Scaffold this active site. Sequence first.
Site, PDB file in Angstrom:
ATOM      1  N   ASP A 190      32.728 -33.537 -48.693  1.00  0.00           N
ATOM      2  CA  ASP A 190      33.701 -33.984 -49.741  1.00  0.00           C
ATOM      3  C   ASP A 190      33.338 -34.736 -51.259  1.00  0.00           C
ATOM      4  O   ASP A 190      32.119 -34.672 -51.461  1.00  0.00           O
ATOM      5  CB  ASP A 190      34.561 -35.591 -49.140  1.00  0.00           C
ATOM      6  CG  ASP A 190      34.459 -35.756 -47.152  1.00  0.00           C
ATOM      7  OD1 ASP A 190      35.069 -34.261 -46.461  1.00  0.00           O
ATOM      8  OD2 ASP A 190      34.167 -36.782 -46.722  1.00  0.00           O
ATOM      9  N   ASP A 229      36.420 -29.800 -46.707  1.00  0.00           N
ATOM     10  CA  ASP A 229      36.729 -31.074 -45.796  1.00  0.00           C
ATOM     11  C   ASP A 229      37.678 -31.434 -46.666  1.00  0.00           C
ATOM     12  O   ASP A 229      38.311 -31.078 -47.472  1.00  0.00           O
ATOM     13  CB  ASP A 229      35.361 -31.643 -45.472  1.00  0.00           C
ATOM     14  CG  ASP A 229      35.675 -32.364 -43.927  1.00  0.00           C
ATOM     15  OD1 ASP A 229      36.577 -31.666 -43.001  1.00  0.00           O
ATOM     16  OD2 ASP A 229      35.379 -33.376 -43.920  1.00  0.00           O
ATOM     17  N   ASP A 233      37.858 -38.802 -48.792  1.00  0.00           N
ATOM     18  CA  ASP A 233      37.496 -39.211 -46.847  1.00  0.00           C
ATOM     19  C   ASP A 233      37.692 -40.494 -46.595  1.00  0.00           C
ATOM     20  O   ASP A 233      36.103 -41.266 -47.867  1.00  0.00           O
ATOM     21  CB  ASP A 233      36.898 -38.818 -46.359  1.00  0.00           C
ATOM     22  CG  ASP A 233      38.097 -37.299 -46.059  1.00  0.00           C
ATOM     23  OD1 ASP A 233      39.151 -36.999 -46.279  1.00  0.00           O
ATOM     24  OD2 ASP A 233      37.573 -36.745 -45.910  1.00  0.00           O
ATOM     25  N   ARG A 285      47.038 -34.492 -44.756  1.00  0.00           N
ATOM     26  CA  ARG A 285      46.271 -35.666 -44.575  1.00  0.00           C
ATOM     27  C   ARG A 285      46.965 -35.797 -46.089  1.00  0.00           C
ATOM     28  O   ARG A 285      45.827 -36.617 -46.942  1.00  0.00           O
ATOM     29  CB  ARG A 285      45.143 -35.767 -44.464  1.00  0.00           C
ATOM     30  CG  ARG A 285      44.505 -35.196 -43.401  1.00  0.00           C
ATOM     31  CD  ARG A 285      43.437 -35.128 -42.680  1.00  0.00           C
ATOM     32  NE  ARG A 285      42.600 -34.468 -41.673  1.00  0.00           N
ATOM     33  CZ  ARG A 285      41.738 -34.494 -41.547  1.00  0.00           C
ATOM     34  NH1 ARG A 285      40.249 -34.621 -42.042  1.00  0.00           N
ATOM     35  NH2 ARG A 285      41.272 -33.970 -39.945  1.00  0.00           N
TER      36      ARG A 285
HETATM   37 CA   LIG Z   1      34.849 -35.935 -45.301  1.00  0.00          CA
END
Ligand SMILES: [Ca+2]
Length: 416
Positions: A190, A229, A233, A285
């Site tokens: 990320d 990804d 996050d 998301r």
């Molecule tokens: Ca991640």
Amino acid sequence: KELGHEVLKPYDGWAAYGEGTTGGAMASPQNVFVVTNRTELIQALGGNNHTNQYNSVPKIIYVKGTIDLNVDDNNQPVGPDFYKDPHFDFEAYLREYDPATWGKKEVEGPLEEARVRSQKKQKDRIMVYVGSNTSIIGVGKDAKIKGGGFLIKNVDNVIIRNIEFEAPLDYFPEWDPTDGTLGEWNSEYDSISIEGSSHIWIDHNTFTDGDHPDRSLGTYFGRPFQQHDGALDIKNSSDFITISYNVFTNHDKVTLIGASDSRMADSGHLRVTLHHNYYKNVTQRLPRVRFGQVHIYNNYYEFSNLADYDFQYAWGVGVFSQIYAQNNYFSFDWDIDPSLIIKVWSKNEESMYETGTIVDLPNGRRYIDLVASYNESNTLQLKKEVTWKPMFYHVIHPTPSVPALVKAKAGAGNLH
Ligand SMILES: [Ca+2]
């Protein structure tokens, strides 16, 4: 004072809780750095990537120009060949684990083990650890980070601002034949990963897959080769985080908050505030939440059916989530079914509060009750009710003013 001297406002989101977030603002003049490459960055952070996570000395790090993290110790760009394990070969991996011959059995064997080592070598090099009391600030309008990401793990009080992050590419994605019905490739990196950390302020940054959109990554096993990804996050009991005035564009999975339905350790945490962010042509998301009291307000979501990235959903209502959404503005250039904007992943009637939402579609622009919209077309119902009241905010703007404001001020290079 300097930009690195700026701190989070007293009531600006969950990160303002208690003493708030000051990052490396109180850094001594000898702990204020200007970095232009991977080595200088790791040196400014402590001198050793792995142990840098334990460096809690107040420090300000200014990022000047483009910093490619996918480079050797001489700061020269490296390719997958640099990371490749002697026992790993992509073609051999494809032949060995293709669903058409390996089926849905657990992926194992020397080739997978070799992939894991190759992945670990890239991970240990491109994911930069950030210690406590750190402010990483981009210089001017062209501060950029590419080929890697920041790992904010088990630390506290960190500020990241004014940087354009080109999502890192995982050269050795893991193939999971049981992820979904058709299976999926999954990556680890990320641009910013917050794990077990608190009091983090991510502000005025831009996140994009940039020159490497998923569309250009190809397809293997009949599935998109997902080398990206998350953009940002948040997981493993992280807490008190404020995500503001950032741009998230051209990316699939943007922001995960809580990575597991069974990690009860997240209960009572994952308190995050996301406001004035510009989500443009992203897939899902935005964010996807589990356990936390997450305040989502004044965000602008804009999608075009011509974008390389399809749109799946914006707000993911996960287990025990307590989303409180206010005055967010959505714009679509096609007549999407608004019941698709919210997606629920739970076995219970979750609760969330939502108000002041505007949807701007070709068939009209108007205020809409997204929870009601979701309920009318779905099975598992969502209860709209106030279970908590957000207190950490200075101002919530009227929904119709959101687009102009966010488009003008969100993202790297749009401060001062
Ligand atoms: Ca991640």
